[PDB]
Amino acid sequence: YFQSMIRKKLVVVGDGACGKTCLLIVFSKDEFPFENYVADIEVDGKQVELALWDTAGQEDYDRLRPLSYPDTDVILMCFSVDSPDSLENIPEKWVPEVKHFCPNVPIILVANKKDLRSDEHVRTELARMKQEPVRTDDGRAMAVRIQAYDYLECSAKTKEGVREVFETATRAALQKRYGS
Ligand SMILES: Nc1nc2c(ncn2[C@@H]2O[C@H](COP(=O)(O)OP(=O)(O)O)[C@@H](O)[C@H]2O)c(=O)[nH]1
Annotated domain spans of the chain = 1-180
DSSP 78-93: EEETT-HHHHHHIIII
Interval between CA 104 and ligand 1 midpoint (Å): 29
Distance from the alpha carbon of residue 124 to the mean position of ligand 1, in angstroms: 19
> What CA dihedral angle connects 51, 55, 61 and 62, to 10 degrees?
70
157: which DSSP letter? T
Residues 95/100/106/111 CA torsion (nearest 10 deg)? -20
Cβ neighbours around 110 below 10 Å, total: 32
Mark the binding-site residues for GTP, compressed into ranges: 14-21, 54-58, 112-115
- DSSP letter at 58 equals -
Indicate the fold that domain 1-180 takes in CATH. Rossmann fold (3.40.50)
Q: Name the phi and psi angles at 38, rounded to 5.
A: -100, 125
In one letter, which amino acid is 33? P
137 SS3 class: helix
Distances in Å between the alpha carbon of 29 and those of 37, 43, 143, 151?
11, 20, 28, 24
Residues with C-beta less than 6 Å from any ligand 1 atom: 14, 16-22, 56, 112-113, 115-116, 155-157
Structural method: X-ray
Beta-carbon contacts of residue 23 (< 8 Å; ≥ 6 apart): 12, 76, 78, 110, 112, 154, 156, 162, 165
Alpha helices (runs of H) in 14-160, residue ranges in sequence order: 20-29, 84-89, 95-101, 120-128, 136-145
* Residue 50 dihedral angles phi and psi, to the nearest 5°: -105, 115
Residues 6+ apart with CB under 8 A from 113: 18, 19, 80, 81, 82, 155, 156, 157
Please identify, by atom number, the ligand 1 atom nearest to the C-alpha of residue 114.
27
What are the helix and strand counts (H, E) for the chain? 6, 6
Amino acid at 77: M
What resolution in angstroms, rounded to 1 decimal?
A: 1.9
Integer angstrom CA distances of residue 179 from 8, 17, 102, 176: 17, 34, 11, 10
Q: 19 C-alpha vs ligand 1 centroid, how far in Å?
A: 4
